[PDB]
Symmetry: C2
Subunit: 192 residues, 2 copies
């Protein structure tokens, strides 16, 4: 039984995140994808980010949201995320998924060997990421061997950064994310 | 009332189309965007299929609607016909024709574009880094330096109809690339070889 773990800030979550989750679940025949909003940060309150993710993933039986990073403590380390989730899901083979840029930083930290005993890794990026970052890709691939995969997601052209700025400038967020998330951003006035 | 006109094949329609329509409606304070599937590529889905997908996808939005003027008129679609018909249906309205930047280039590069500008204003939408042909770049540039045409960039148009079709052919998920209703419609009707 294979379990996907998508680690992100989700500030806000959008269709790029959701497409990426579906793609990864299909490419590796995952039975479920657990969305884990990170604790550590500026960044919206963890509850806002948690609720937005609950709203966006609710209607999908194969998506779920975990509070392991939010509840644990100050700074979020992927080794912690995987440790907690390994305990909750000892059955499951973990496929940790996040931005290719974040993954580069995560693998470059102390105890990266500890990471490979806990999970397989999937870096996601918007199109043409290997051209702009040919060395990060080259180093990631070579360190992890076939314990890591980089996949390109056209929909990740949608970014949390653009979403936030559209909200700041009162430009519509329709069809970039579920209406529920759009309204949540509005109702809580998340980005001024 | 300022009326948006989204001309496309919509085979299939997706969030890229919908984001672009939303953006253009906001940029030009449009009161409504009318989606017009073209009449009728190796094969293109039947017009009714493309119409229903567009109806499904735009339904929940009070400011979107779908027209059959191109579908019903005849075989091949001319924008001048589309603009003629919709002006008759909305004589009050100032028409804002919106389509793919590549398509807009072609429309402008064919005889009688001068005939078009009296009927509507034009908006080309494109995905970032979109590699147009050269005769299209030249055609857009000329109109751009005269400020007779507007181009807006839509990150969400990185989602394309071609990739959706291929994902459907290869039984790869279309979730969150388009509304579930359109996802299911493609499936239920087996639109791209299942």
């Amino acid at each position: 039984r294979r379990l996907g773990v998508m680690g992100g800030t989700f500030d806000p979550i959008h269709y790029g995140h959701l497409v990426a989750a579906s793609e990864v679940a299909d490419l590796f025949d995952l039975d479920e994808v657990v969305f884990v909003p990170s604790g550590q940060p500026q960044v919206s309150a963890a509850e806002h980010r948690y609720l937005m993710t609950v709203i966006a993933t609710a209607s999908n039986p194969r998506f779920s949201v975990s509070r392991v990073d939010i509840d644990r403590g100050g700074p979020t380390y992927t080794k912690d995320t995987l440790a907690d989730l390994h305990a909750l899901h000892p059955d499951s083979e973990l496929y940790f998924t996040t931005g290719a840029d974040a993954l580069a930083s995560i693998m470059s930290a102390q105890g990266w060997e500890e990471l490979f005993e806990l999970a397989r890794f999937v870096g996601v990026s918007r199109p043409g990421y290997e051209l702009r970052n040919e060395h990060i890709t080259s180093l990631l691939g070579q360190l992890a061997k076939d314990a890591l995969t980089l996949v390109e997601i056209p929909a990740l052209a949608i970014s949390s950064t653009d979403c936030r700025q559209r909200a700041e400038q009162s430009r519509p967020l329709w069809y970039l994310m579920p209406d529920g998330v759009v309204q949540y951003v509005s109702k809580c006035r998340l980005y001024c």
